[PDB]
Write a protein that binds this DNA or RNA. Structure first.
Ligand SMILES: [Mg+2]
Ligand SMILES: [Mg+2]
Ligand SMILES: [Mg+2]
Ligand SMILES: [Mg+2]
Ligand SMILES: [Mg+2]
Ligand SMILES: [Mg+2]
Ligand SMILES: [Mg+2]
Ligand SMILES: [Mg+2]
Ligand SMILES: [Mg+2]
Ligand SMILES: [Mg+2]
Ligand SMILES: [Mg+2]
Ligand SMILES: [Mg+2]
Ligand SMILES: [Mg+2]
Ligand SMILES: [Mg+2]
Ligand SMILES: [Mg+2]
Ligand SMILES: [Mg+2]
Ligand SMILES: [Mg+2]
Ligand SMILES: [Mg+2]
Ligand SMILES: [Mg+2]
Ligand SMILES: [Mg+2]
Ligand SMILES: [Mg+2]
Ligand SMILES: [Mg+2]
Ligand SMILES: [Mg+2]
Ligand SMILES: [Mg+2]
Ligand SMILES: [Mg+2]
Lengths: 62, 119, 152
RNA sequence: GAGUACGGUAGAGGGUGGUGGAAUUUCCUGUGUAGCGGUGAAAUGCGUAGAUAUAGGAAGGAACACCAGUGGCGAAGGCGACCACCUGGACUGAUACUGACACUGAGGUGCGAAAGCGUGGGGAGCAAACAGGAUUAGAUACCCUGGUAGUCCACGCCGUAAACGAUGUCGACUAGCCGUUGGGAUCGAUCUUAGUGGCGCAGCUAACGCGAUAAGUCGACCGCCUGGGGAGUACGGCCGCAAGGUUAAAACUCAAAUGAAUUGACGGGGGCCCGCACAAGCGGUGGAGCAUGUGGUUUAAUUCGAAGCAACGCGAAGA
């Protein structure tokens, strides 16, 4: 979420560095996850669906 | 009618889903001027585009140039569009970029967010 | 068309001037297949241009179309609940078509003795830009900046 | 079979105190100005009485991102900040010990999400009721701006849930393959245990499907069902402060109600493709006058028929 400037490179490489750092931080995901309250039933349902999708992907890898 | 000089101030971006607010202060956080996409004549649906963010940022920078401000430390806060528009648009006014920081407040557990929208 | 197999025919039958844009303007001004009527009307208009204008009339013609062609065009797209408009760069071939159509349709609305001297009047007006066709062109052009927000 | 003694592991298992950081809100102060907020678009609302952004400070409440996992623990409900104290159970290794001390269980006895009730506290965010602004034919809703009980704590009550694996507890047998949690043994591999998942042979099933975590093959005990409504309702009994809970009918009425799967049709489901279907253009109808057909009215008759696209210059290529 913060990057320094040094050694007079063009103001595009640092921009892509900042973008990459922000998307490594995952700020957008967390700020989207706080827009509305998710009741726990929906949370367990989403986690179960993600788990079954992940296991299906891993099985289909062979 | 008085006049004062300042160098190496800080510019701030509040980029929400509906608007973006660009302000300029000194290192002590005292406002000099400010620009808002609402006051530029965008009014809602147009208010959200990154182009309006660029316009507001460049207007704020041009207003800041009167006091000098050869250096600018910029904070951005909020997930709205134009999170990157203002960063590029500030150089259009001829400013030296010293640090770009993201200060989006992340609740750890905190209060509870409002109810889900049923649309 | 979904298939996109429809090729285009090429027309080049300039009688005496041996140009290209002239014939397409002929087709634009031609109405109900009156090709010879279009011949004589446009040639009388060009004669009036030549007697009024010191230089040759073809470069005046192309300069007039240079000041009527719109660089960008606005086109409505509905976002699914709101009626927006989007500015887009005009296709290079489409520029000449818009130029010719606008110039003809604006020369049609003068109201003087005939449309030969109407065509001459807007050909000289568009030669620098004090006509009404240039007025519509600049209005459409400025609508783009009026809607630059969406663009993408 | 069951249990006891002895070492070692893992865990959001329970209870009582203390302590953390982030974030929201409110209040105070500083420069600075005219907008902020919100939406599909708006408006209500907040605004030079200086907001949001921003800097500094103060109080207060609640939840514990990242770890985090088909992961773990608990009889079930359920249990995620860190630390100490009190405490229950499970897993694992060898030896000794008790010598059937077991399983199930009508009655009864407890624990039991959320909402709710009583007394006393607290109250930041959220949010039934409610107020206003929208949308609409209406909108006592969905959407937006606020907002009270409640959500938080102590004690007491209430006994309910799609309280679900819609699958009672206990025990013994029956091909295999790929994960994973936490322990052992042998030489990364193999072997063996208690869980936790995905496939799958026999076998079972109306079918779906289950398949060593059986819905297979068998035993022990218990609970429950007998067409759909009426109805988990009435009356009586027993509980509760109340809300209500539990046990639990009949008259009357119908010839069905129901489960799984199949073909088609449909969808404000999805994916590909086509057509003057849109889009890009040109010229029209709807406005005026007249021709011609039809509907309606009148008449003695205005002779019959054709009626969304697929009737109306149509049978009629001649009243
Ligand atoms: Mg909201
Ligand atoms: Mg403030
Ligand atoms: Mg028992
Ligand atoms: Mg009993
Ligand atoms: Mg009991
Ligand atoms: Mg409760
Ligand atoms: Mg209470
Ligand atoms: Mg109270
Ligand atoms: Mg509301
Ligand atoms: Mg009440
Ligand atoms: Mg029940
Ligand atoms: Mg449960
Ligand atoms: Mg049941
Ligand atoms: Mg068994
Ligand atoms: Mg299977
Ligand atoms: Mg069965
Ligand atoms: Mg019956
Ligand atoms: Mg009852
Ligand atoms: Mg009773
Ligand atoms: Mg279909
Ligand atoms: Mg069209
Ligand atoms: Mg007509
Ligand atoms: Mg008419
Ligand atoms: Mg008839
Ligand atoms: Mg016809």
């Amino acid at each position: 979420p913060a990057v320094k400037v040094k050694e007079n490179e063009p103001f595009d490489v640092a921009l892509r560095r900042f973008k990459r750092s922000c998307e490594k931080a995952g700020v957008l995901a967390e700020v989207r996850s706080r827009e509305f309250y998710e009741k726990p039933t929906a949370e367990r349902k989403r986690k179960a669906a993600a788990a079954v999708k992940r296991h299906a992907k891993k099985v289909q890898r062979e | 009618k008085v006049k004062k000089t300042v160098v190496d101030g800080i510019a701030h971006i509040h980029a929400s889903f509906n608007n973006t607010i660009v302000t300029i202060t000194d290192r002590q956080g005292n406002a000099l001027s400010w620009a808002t996409s609402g006051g530029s004549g965008f009014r809602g649906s147009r208010k959200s585009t990154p182009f309006a963010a660029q316009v507001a940022a460049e207007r704020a920078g041009q207003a800041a140039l009167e006091y000098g401000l050869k250096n600018l430390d910029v904070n951005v806060k909020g997930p709205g569009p134009g999170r990157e528009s203002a960063v590029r648009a500030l150089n259009a006014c001829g400013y030296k970029i010293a640090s770009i920081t993201d200060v989006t407040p992340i609740p750890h557990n905190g209060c509870r967010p409002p109810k889900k929208r049923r649309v | 068309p979904r298939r996109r197999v429809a090729a285009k025919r090429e027309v080049l039958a300039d009688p005496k001037y041996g140009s290209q844009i002239l014939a397409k303007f002929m087709n634009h001004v031609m109405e109900s297949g009156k090709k010879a009527v279009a011949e004589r009307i446009v040639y009388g208009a060009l004669d009036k241009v030549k007697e009024r204008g010191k230089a040759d009339p073809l470069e005046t013609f192309e300069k007039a179309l240079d000041a009527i062609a719109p660089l960008v065009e606005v086109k409505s797209r509905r976002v699914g609940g709101a009626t927006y408009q989007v500015p887009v760069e005009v296709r290079p071939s489409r520029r000449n078509a818009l130029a010719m159509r606008w110039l003809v349709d604006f020369a049609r609305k003068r109201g003087e003795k005939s449309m030969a001297l109407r065509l001459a009047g807007e050909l000289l007006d568009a030669a620098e830009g004090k006509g009404a066709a240039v007025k519509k062109r600049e209005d459409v052009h400025r609508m783009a900046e009026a809607n630059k927000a969406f663009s993408h």
